Design a protein around this ligand. Structure first.
Ligand code: ZN
Ligand code: ZN
Ligand code: ZN
Length: 572
């Protein structure tokens, strides 16, 4: 019952029994908590409660020390000291922001803003509290039981009354009863088991709520600048292919952590792998939140780094298929490729943390906890998509509050900017450069003259809250009859349910904007589906249209975003 004060570090025996995470608070801080919030339970070796038989007074503000023991006003002996006096709470060794973090329900943007503008120890408290609150909310959704099994990929579900039903997308992973993890898509529902299984009737599905470990390591270790490349040995022969990156590579070596903002198709992957070739003896751990981002770093590594010195870490509770072509789970290889959640406790010359817009402050802490390293490299794009905040329903989370790295990239700027898009037709590069990159992103490719926009609001139907626009798909179908090059196009929308309808009617492969992030395709068809905050978010829009290598068709609901597309407008 003895720890350091999460606000100021001062030793104490006071934790807040009201806070879900029960943080150690110093007497000066514990007071300013209890006297400002509904949080009145203080703990030490024993609870600060009235010790008189049958008395229920736990409010420290109505409590006194009578000898060794605590009493309320009604029970205290004549010789007693109140537990709250002169801005302190009686403890051994004798905050506005802490209070808002400790009591918020995390449904408001301002809660995430504060969890990212605050002091560094408060970012860990916030990150821990948020994640705790996120997991306890999963317990609020109704259990799903299998009524009947139609096919090997479709069944009929019965939903517990008196509890709400979860969104049936790829985000929401269920546990079958442990008969493998399962997702569902929309009275016929499409089921997808991790382990293939004759899905027994009576079997039930639940959202597994994993207990939240406390955090220790800061989001960002403290910054160190060096006069010379520290702890790394650069090649004197580096292939022309990576010549562009040498100054950035020397910056990586001359400070503790560095930030790389790389817009779509600007060479983030190339940069990350180019780092190993420039520091050829350096042990490098390649990490991201998702298997897809880590796999993408693997595909690049396979092309440039010796396969014998690469390992893909894969936890024995596997959830998707991972990259196969490396030795699996060899923690000691020079090159290690591993999701944040699966990181081993180890050291490294360089940690490369990729897709940083998708990381939470929880993830940034875990990494600094599990990996002791000479250099930390943070790669991604704050103009791209953050991790979903399942609890956030009010306000929009701006890129400067995604996590500590994005806040740095949005405030003091990134240490390094990849400024030339080599993926996208210039029509797309020019659109996004103006929209989210302050005109700093340059087109390598010419205009493709295969980038089209149509303003067509259509009709918005909903499967629950998930939007569908059949007329927008109708327009796409018409377009395809006259544009046969697009037969191979990937269909993209901000909505799973629009994607389900586009699958049936068009037969095109289908992606949400959020699932499309990090991928590229020759041709993209985008239906905005709706005018909502979701569908008009400039980051989501940016990702949507930068997936395309050759052509994009955008059926738009929003005038502002429509007019900004530097595309040939179509009629109908
Ligand atoms: Zn509290
Ligand atoms: Zn304190
Ligand atoms: Zn009492």
């Amino acid at each position: 019952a003895v720890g350091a004060c999460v606000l100021c570090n001062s030793q104490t025996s006071l934790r807040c029994g009201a806070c879900i995470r029960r943080p150690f608070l110093c007497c000066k801080c514990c007071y300013d908590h209890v006297i400002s919030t509904s949080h009145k339970l203080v703990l030490s070796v024993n609870p600060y409660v009235c010790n008189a038989p049958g008395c229920d007074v736990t409010d420290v503000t109505q409590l006194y020390l009578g000898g060794m023991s605590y009493y309320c006003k009604s029970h205290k002996p004549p010789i007693s000291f109140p537990l709250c006096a002169n801005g302190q709470v009686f403890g051994l060794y004798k905050v506005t922001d802490f209070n808002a973090i400790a009591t918020c329900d995390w449904t408001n943007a301002g809660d995430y803003i504060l969890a990212n503008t605050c002091t560094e120890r408060l970012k860990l408290f916030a990150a821990e509290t948020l994640k705790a609150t996120e997991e306890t909310f999963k317990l609020s959704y109704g259990i799903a039981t299998v009524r009947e099994v139609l096919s090997d990929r479709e069944l009929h579900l019965s939903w517990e009354v008196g509890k709400p039903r979860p969104p049936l997308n790829r985000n929401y992973v269920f546990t079958g009863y442990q008969i493998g993890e399962y997702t569902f898509e929309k009275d016929a529902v499409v089921y997808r088991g991790t382990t293939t299984y004759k899905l027994n009737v009576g079997d039930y599905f639940v959202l597994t709520s994993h207990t939240v470990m406390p955090l220790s390591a800061p989001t960002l270790v403290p910054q160190e600048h060096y006069v010379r490349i520290t702890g790394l040995y650069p090649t004197l022969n580096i292939s022309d292919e990576f010549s562009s990156n040498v100054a950035n590579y020397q910056k990586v070596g001359m400070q503790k952590y560095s930030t790389l903002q790389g817009p779509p198709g600007t060479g983030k992957s190339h940069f990350a792998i180019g780092l190993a070739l420039y520091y050829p003896s350096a042990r490098i751990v390649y990490t991201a939140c998702s298997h897809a981002a880590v796999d993408a770093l693997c595909e690049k590594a396979l092309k440039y780094l010796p396969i014998d010195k690469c390992s893909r870490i894969i936890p024995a509770r596997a959830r998707v298929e991972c990259f196969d072509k490396f030795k699996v789970n060899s923690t000691l290889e020079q090159y290690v490729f591993c999701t944040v959640n699966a990181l081993p406790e180890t050291t490294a010359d360089i940690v490369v943390f990729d897709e940083i817009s998708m990381a939470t402050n929880y993830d940034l802490s875990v990494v600094n906890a599990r990996l002791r390293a000479k250099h930390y490299v943070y790669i991604g794009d704050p103009a791209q998509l953050p991790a979903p905040r399942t609890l956030l329903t009010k306000g929009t989370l701006e890129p400067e509050y995604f996590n500590s790295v994005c806040r740095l990239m949005k405030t003091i700027g990134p240490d390094m900017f990849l400024g030339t898009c080599r993926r996208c037709p210039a029509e797309i590069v020019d659109t996004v450069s103006a929209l989210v990159y302050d005109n700093k992103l340059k087109a390598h490719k010419d205009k493709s003259a295969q980038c089209f926009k149509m303003f067509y609001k259509g009709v918005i139907t909903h499967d629950v809250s998930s939007a569908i626009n059949r007329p927008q798909i109708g327009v796409v179908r018409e377009f395809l009859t006259r544009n046969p090059a697009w037969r191979k196009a990937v269909f993209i929308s901000p909505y799973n349910s629009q994607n389900a309808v586009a699958s049936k009617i068009l037969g095109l492969p289908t992606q949400t904007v959020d699932s499309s992030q990090g991928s590229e395709y020759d041709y993209v068809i985008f239906t905005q589906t709706t005018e909502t905050a979701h569908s008009c978010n400039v980051n989501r829009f940016n990702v949507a249209i930068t997936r395309a290598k050759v052509g994009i068709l955008c059926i738009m609901s929003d005038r502002d975003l429509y007019d900004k597309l530097q595309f040939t407008s179509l009629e109908i």
